[PDB]
Amino acid sequence: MASISVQYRAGDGSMNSNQIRPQLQIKNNGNTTVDLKDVTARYWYKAKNKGQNFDCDYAQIGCGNVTHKFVTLHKPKQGADTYLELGFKNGTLAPGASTGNIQLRLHNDDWSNYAQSGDYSFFKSNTFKTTKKITLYDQGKLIWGTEPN
């Protein structure tokens, strides 16, 4: 299996009301030294607008030039067409603040308000902990891309 451990917490199948903020616990359990300098995650959500922005709540992965991605597709696969997330460009230069937890605020744009009680209803996430939680790339390649089922 992989060398990274991640946990997810938020809601089983609740709505959004434009105001959301999912939290997760990402920690390299199978590695002693890891840098979030070339790690980027990818999340999905049913919408039209490309989101609004994010707010820092609680993090311990250093700091840097983390970039935010935001795109929209006209393909409602399961229950999401819009894909927004972040890409860490740093975190530390030595083992220490590379294994902790990540929690932030997620404010969407009040242009197209939707609820995740439709997509999460068929997913039932935020209840299991698997190595594969979402689609993300690390070290220059893709490794994860699936929710805990």
Virtual CA dihedral for 12, 134, 70, 27, nearest 10 degrees? 100
3-state DSSP percent of the chain in helix, strand and coil, to 5: 0, 35, 60
Q: Which domains does the chain have, with CATH numbers?
A: 1-149 (2.60.40.710)
Q: What is the Cα–Cα distance from 143 to 128, expressed in whole angstroms?
A: 19
Question: What angle (nearest 5°) sits at the alpha carbon of residue 16, between those of residues 137 and 144?
Answer: 15
Contact assessment for residue 120 and residue 44, using Cβ atoms and an 8 Å cutoff: no
Distances (CA, A) of 88 to 1, 8, 74, 115: 23, 18, 27, 27
Method of elucidation: NMR
Alpha carbon distance 124, 92 (integer Å): 34
C-alpha separations of 64 from 54, 60, 118, 149 in Å: 15, 12, 35, 33
CA-CA distances (angstroms) from residue 31 to 2, 81, 99, 137, 138?
A: 10, 34, 10, 17, 14
Contact 58, 103 (CB under 8 A): yes
Provide the b/e sequence for 40-61 (b: ≥16 CB within 10 Å).
Answer: bbbbbbbbebbbeebeeeebeb
Q: Are 88 and 50 in contact (CB under 8 A)?
A: no
